[PDB]
Amino acid sequence: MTPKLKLNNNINWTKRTIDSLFDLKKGEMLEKELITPEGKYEYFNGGVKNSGRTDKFNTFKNTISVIVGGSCGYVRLADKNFFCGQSNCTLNLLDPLELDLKFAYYALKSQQERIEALAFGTTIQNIRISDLKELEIPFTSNKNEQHAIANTLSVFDERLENLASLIEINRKLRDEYAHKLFSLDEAFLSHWKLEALQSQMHEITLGEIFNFKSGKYLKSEERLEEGKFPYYGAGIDNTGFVAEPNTEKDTISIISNGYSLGNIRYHEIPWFNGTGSIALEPMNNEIYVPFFYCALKYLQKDIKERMKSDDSPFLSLKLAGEIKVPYVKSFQLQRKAGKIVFLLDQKLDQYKKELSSLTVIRDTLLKKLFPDMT
Template identity: 25%
Template sequence: MSRKVIPPGYKLTEVGVIPEDWLLQKLGLHASFRTGPFGSALHKSDYVDGGIPVVNPMQIVDGKVVPTFSMAISGDAAKKLVEFRLSVGDVVIGRRGDMGRCAVITEKENGWLCGTGSMIIRVKPSCDAAFLQRILSSASVISAIENTSVGTTMINLNQGTLRELQIVLPENKNEQIAIANALSDTDELIAILEHLIAKKQSIKTATMQQLLTGRTRLPQFAKHPDGTIKGYKSGELGHIPEDWEEREIGKFAPLQRGFDLPASKRSEGLYPVVYSNGIVNTHNHFQVKGPGVVTGRSGTLGKVHHIACDFWPHNTSLWVTKFINSDSKFVYYIFKYIGFERFASGSGVPTLNRNDAHSFKVAIPSSLKEQTAIATILSDMDAELTVLEKKLSKIRNIKQGMMQQLLTGRIRLPLDNQP
């Protein structure tokens, strides 16, 4: 039997290989615990809008406390529960339901109340609170907590479980802080990207609204050949550009139900089968020449897909049979902007009413070139969003890897000031 090779500078413990200068100890050596007050300690009359927030598990989101100000109590009620008030540097953890919901209390949350579904972890000087929060939200520790907590339908975390919980941590507190800071920097980068994506998405939504209704014209289509500005005209849909027209969907992008996929045609192949909710590569024969636009027929309404290659529209989908003086990508964006959920019918599984969709009128440019130009701008914005979303996904994956490596000591960070 081969023996496990221990790398230099590491040691073997009951939880695996860890650095020689790291500790495997019970959490109770580094913190004390206080369960939130029993429900009977608070009465309905104690709750007020805009009072002192109460922190229950649902107020702990992604390692931060997100208050619900309707879940707050009066100052008088809080005075009776001083021992349950949160202090800067505490870790508050949810003790019911999903484990791993925990956050470090900052100056902003100082004095807020630990709710009945939460627990206060008062961290001792030997441990950094931010590092401990990362430990408690790691997959391995969550699993250990779940395996030792009580409850069958809903896990209930108690003080004894936390007190006896074995954790791995650097003996050097500076290293704990360095690890927590590195993970916080990654969180900050993720938050910046999330904010940027949300901002870009809002800009795209506003751009769609302006360009697809003609409220904003692209410069190359906004003027007559003599240089005068093109005006607007009145119609059933209100004011639209003078060189646009109101057309029923059925007159420029008629829809047809997709086809059954015979078992004999199913194989790993080249052409995508487009279902109501996505694309699956399953066969080597196509039914329709691309490009095309497909939307859900039943159940998954509102999902619209632009397909650049040849494809097989599945019978759960509706597909545009022909583009009559219309650009396929422009039709795709028009369909997304309209929101095909509006054409749902049926009391059970919602089904798209094709007749209602066909008779629905929209304003579109008479010029195919203008349609294509609008679609190109929106497509470029989508491409930028896709790049950012892939980058965000990659950084999230990197963060998960960092947590696994840093919190177990497999990767060590350089420390500027050794004790």
């Protein structure tokens, strides 16, 4: 009973049954006519996600639950009032003074695989309540240590929650801005001082403002897994790294092959253009590349959909050169328009990177902070 990450010295860790720490109650049957997509509360039954919404609740926020039918073993700490269903079980603290709520949640959460293992069946899975009660979890009666561990794993959880909320806010605003931009919404052009676009914006083909190169190809013996300069080749993200980049920063690429065909990205750093990839290099300095990136992202679904009804093939340099995008000649005006959308893209990109990074860190710390019982 020694955690791999120790916050304090000489902590006495012990095993405790769920029965010795919690009061267990299964949820209730929610009648179908009480389920409405516009309902105030979540219906948490057998899923990790809700099984619907309602205007009824039977469980206050800040109650721990464990799924005992369906996605068995899953541990939740609800931050909103909710409707607990029959495949879900609440675990109420027997003594709040011996045991911190948030610590209790993490102690249970760290043993999630061992709770899952209690289930019978695979396709239809159930946990018996009497088995759940008998499961031992790691415990310490040191309150300072309970708070230290709960504090460490809350800051992660609260940031992830806030990040998810930020991504969703900024995804919708970004979509709105792009749509109002490229359709030239009058009220939007007024507010953002882009009235000049009304007269000046027209269609150009990509081949008139960019030059194209298809991706080059490197053997596994010519790649690194950690490097400075990313290799890009047919997945949306880098397949490893490179010694010498072959393409400059401030460039666009489009995947030409496979299932990620027609996906567009902007390059902030020098990179390697690999086999299922096309690079776009602006023909002169008067091109604000991120304007065009935004324009292509706006059209990305349309391009994919067109490539589908093409042959089911690849995107050639010929076809890519033919892509029509909105265009204004003025550099200052490309930047002024483009920046409104593109600053949200960059914000969203950092948020998604941080969310992905902290998810991994949070999983790592949760495992290391509690004694291993397998």
